[PDB]
Design a protein around this ligand. Sequence first.
Ligand SMILES: [Zn+2]
Lengths: 206, 201, 398, 472, 50, 99
Amino acid sequence: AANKRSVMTLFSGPTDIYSHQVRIVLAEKGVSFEIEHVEKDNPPQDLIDLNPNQSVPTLVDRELTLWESRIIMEYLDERFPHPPLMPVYPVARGESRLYMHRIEKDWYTLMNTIINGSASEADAARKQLREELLAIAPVFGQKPYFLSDEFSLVDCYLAPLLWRLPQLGIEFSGPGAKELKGYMTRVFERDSFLASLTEAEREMRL
Amino acid sequence: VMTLFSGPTDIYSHQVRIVLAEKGVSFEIEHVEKDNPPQDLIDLNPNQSVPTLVDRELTLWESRIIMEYLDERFPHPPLMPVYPVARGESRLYMHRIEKDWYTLMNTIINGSASEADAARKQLREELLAIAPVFGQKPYFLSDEFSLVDCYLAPLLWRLPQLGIEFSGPGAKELKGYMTRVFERDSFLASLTEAEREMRLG
Amino acid sequence: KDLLKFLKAQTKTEEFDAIKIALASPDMIRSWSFGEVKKPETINYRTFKPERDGLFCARIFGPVKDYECLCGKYKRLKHRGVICEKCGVEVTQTKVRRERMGHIELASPTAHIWFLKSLPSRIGLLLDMPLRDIERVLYFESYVVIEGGMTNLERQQILTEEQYLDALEEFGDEFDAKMGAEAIQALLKSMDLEQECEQLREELNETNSETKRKKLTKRIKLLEAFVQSGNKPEWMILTVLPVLPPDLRPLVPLDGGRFATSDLNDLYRRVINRNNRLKRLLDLAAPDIIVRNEKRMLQEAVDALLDNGRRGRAITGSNKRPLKSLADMIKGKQGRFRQNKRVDYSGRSVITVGPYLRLHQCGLPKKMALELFKPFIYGKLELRGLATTIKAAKKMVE
Amino acid sequence: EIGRTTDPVRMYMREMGTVELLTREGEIDIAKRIEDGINQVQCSVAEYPEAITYLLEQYDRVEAEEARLSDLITGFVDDPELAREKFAELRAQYVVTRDTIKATAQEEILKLSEVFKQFRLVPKQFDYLVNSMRVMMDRVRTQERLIMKLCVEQCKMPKKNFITLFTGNETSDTWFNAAIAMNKPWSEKLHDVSEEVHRALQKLQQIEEETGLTIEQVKDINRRMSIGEAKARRAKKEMVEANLRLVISIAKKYTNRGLQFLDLIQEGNIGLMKAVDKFEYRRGYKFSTYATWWIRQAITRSIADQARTIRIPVHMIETINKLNRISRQMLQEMGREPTPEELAERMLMPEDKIRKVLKIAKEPISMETPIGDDEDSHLGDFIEDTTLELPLDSATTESLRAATHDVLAGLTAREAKVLRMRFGIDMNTDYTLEEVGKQFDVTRERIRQIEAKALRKLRHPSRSEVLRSFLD
Amino acid sequence: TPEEKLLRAIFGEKASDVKDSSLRVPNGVSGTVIDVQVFTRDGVEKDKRA
Amino acid sequence: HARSTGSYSLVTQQPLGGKAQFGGQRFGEMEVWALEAYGAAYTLQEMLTVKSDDVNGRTKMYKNIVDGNHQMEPGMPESFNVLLKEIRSLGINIELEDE
Ligand SMILES: [Zn+2]
């Protein structure tokens, strides 16, 4: 069937960021996975039968599917070790599990609300969004990433939500963009990102 | 210095207490009013959402982070698998119950008396779903109590106040559970004066 | 959200200014420490690992060997933040054994010998009390009243042993006389720096006396500091005395068997022992001739720690020189304890003449310059390819 | 008279010797006063019918092993050899002493324990009987602090009125009708709040049943007992203040053993406070010839406990003190000096314990001892530290990551990752062989090969010309 | 360390059971060793040079 | 004598002579008033931060030197962090502000 091999099974989404957040860590460890850009109205058959909760994405490896944005990219970082993506000290480790919770519950609602919100909210959210992302400017001077030398998962929660910057109508404004805009030159063109990006999500780059 | 801004009632605050009093952490709780602690925690907690842990450097607001940190840092006894195959089972089995059942109990308490029945019996038939399986292991899919049953011990204990109970079936292979986990000193010395009058134990 | 902007800066107080200093409240001295040192013993005498809950602890001031628990159950690189369940050491670097603090929990208050015996007695002129009377109360020799009420007694009448005893037979309530160092923590605790602040802002005007209204404005200038500053009065009476970290008072082992202790482990053992006994007499319920002699004996050992020498000079044991307390470590050697410092890359030799040199050049022997400029020379021998690696350039200069 | 004296030893004597010594017949006068004091207590627990509630379970489990003879009895006054004839003589009046009130309601319950005076207890469980009824007062007393506040700050009544009708009894329904019927706003107000006044004192209603007797007798069951202890508190103190002059005469022989003088004569007090505790004058021997043991017992048990920095146990200071009591007796006889082996003959050590007892007793040299010439130097300026590392020792390990990131980079792809995962190179903890087999998806004994033959490739020369350069 | 622990497996450098703390002449000195004396605790054998 | 790197003292991490390599010279109080007389203030900062007392600020100035990059990141000396632990161990409460 689906898990009949030692291979994965990922009923990913071609636009939904859960796929694109997963695929970065999914491919950043150099593993042979299967991509299936599929829709909500009509995904593939296996994505609905063995998936009794029916989310996107959905990874299946010889025992059962694993559906979440967190449970997936955690299952891979704890089973495929090298290179590593999360620190060792449990003090500064779970806090690295905190920014991911202060983004999926802080900067996610500013994406859905701009997807189903009124005309002012789309800029109101873009108001609370664009300036707030400038309130985090001086961070990048100290650390080459989000307060961590190594490329860790807390950075992967940003770039897929920094790759949809103007795709939902956003552009920077103010003093100090050269610190963050120059920072985007350091993350947006990595092997973990370059080979991982979905071409459908690229055309909003020009 | 390890403080805790627990609620005296809510199952979430009762979640973390089972982990603390199990591992043996020397902690000190600062109660909340009803489920509202003071306005003096917004400084160390912009969400102001209990529970919240504070130990000399840290701030954490969720049952996920607050309860797994105490596992990844206080090693023994361990409340998780050993090899990465089975963690995703436990790490995801607890995503089921925290999504289906817990928010299901909203209308049973935060929903009108109409929808209290809408949640009541549709959930009870689930309550004996894994009930026969208790003839597999002692605990919920484990021969030794772990983090996965940490969402049931503070869940089962809230039965008679909630309203749904056992009657005939659903209590044969099920009630052996609560008579086996409700006696462990961790769940013994975690019960509070407010969360105790939800039953006769 | 400057919070995430905060913690980046919160853990980064290297750009700063304005070193700020002020008194320390017992709710804060309890907030530097990581545990309560509660025994007098230091190490094990057989296997020199340090004992538990003693002065040189490992559950309190951190581990001993870098990145490794104490028992010997967590050495690997896998676990590097966990705290060992057997002996609750946190497996981190042994540098952190140098910047953690403990704290002892005193079983009875005791005056801070700086703020009690520095010549203008900051406990005195905050109460308008002659210093020869405060010191007659910190030895339990003479009672003092608190909250007189409607009787023939002020708030600070010094009832002697009899005058109170010739007074308490007439009243049992409305009247409270304490004695000892736990009294001055009651005079202060109820005095208010605003009632008697402005009320003295008038009493100075009436007073026409070039000596009276000259130091009268000295007291009211001290009351006027304990309000805007934010320091309550009763924090000058200690209740939890904090302990230095265990690498700034080492117990290093010499070569041969002997140890070379610092002179604080001879003074901390003398407070934790006397305080540990006074915890006992209050359970065995001894008469008030002994325990009343205990506090008088403890308080002489917390004030032999801060500034030893303003008393009987508690000379060292096993030797005949005075011990060296904390305030005898910052005090002047004619130069500051810190910087105003020895220095690497130096040398010295006998000067000679050399009258063939230009005005701007001095000789420098080959045997010296080859020793100061070593880390530069290592640069060339690995840059010009003459040495493959640095360990093979150290054997070409030798 | 306070002539500017500072040191406490001036202040100890200045108040110690104000008291007067005691003649011998005085001492017997005091102990005969204590000896009635406890009898005001222990005989004030026979009044407690629950006195055998803690012990009825003992002899109902002593044979069955829940209570041992060493914790409750010591041999009766005036095992199966002794217990089955005295406790057995209480199995008759045990429950039969309530046949009246199951009138003579208080004779039999008294007659249950009226003979208890000859029953002997042990220091173990005497506390609980004082610890049992003690908390009963806070289960009845401080709760009673709500009745007053309920009547004074909660109903405008005074507090000193209703107590005449209700207090002591602590259970009746007096203010249900007594303080209600006064035709006042508060008397009529008692029924307005007439539940928490009686529901609060319900758990104490358990208490009178908790001991089976009413609250009135319960008051005189403990309140009469308080006088018995305090009849002896002031009694014992008069002896600790009288013979207090003795400890100074005993604690001056030890004046230099690392302990201050004033920490010595304070350790004897805790000794002497125990001697008069267990003093017994019937054996005739004067107090001084018994308090001289418990006193000197302490100051030689404290010196072996808080005299050293690096503490050595108490069972060993007896062995060190023998090596000096015996290496000092072989010093006159032998004349010259003692060897390290004649002690083995003279004493009976195994010829090496005498060589391990010699590397212990030396104390620590203080780290401020001024070294020679008394210059501006101390000892603490010459003891360097070894925890640090040579900055060349830390400039190689920083350099070594150059090679093993370059030499190991000149490998292949699949054959270098496992070479980097089979050690901790550039990662977290290392891994097991088939632990990696679940990483490369091909579980077999090839993983012991790919690393195997590849690391032979790095072993050959000119791929190790820079790596070899680190080994000496 | 982890990096060097590969450096051993590559060549087979047998780890040290014993550390070297001999007595070497202080730097900047040179002179014939005119005399040697050996003291021994009574109870340990004398090697041949002793 | 002459010394380029060697032992370091125990409580305060400055150099000394006890390890076949004597201390550095004494850059005493009198010799800092002769580097403030001139305007010299980079020589003075390295002469009491990198060369003597800092802990992890001088194991970089030895690895910058061996690579030909003469440049230092000072950090705060270790003989001032002992003067805050020796004042807090009294009643006093010394700290630092934030700006
Ligand atoms: Zn351990």
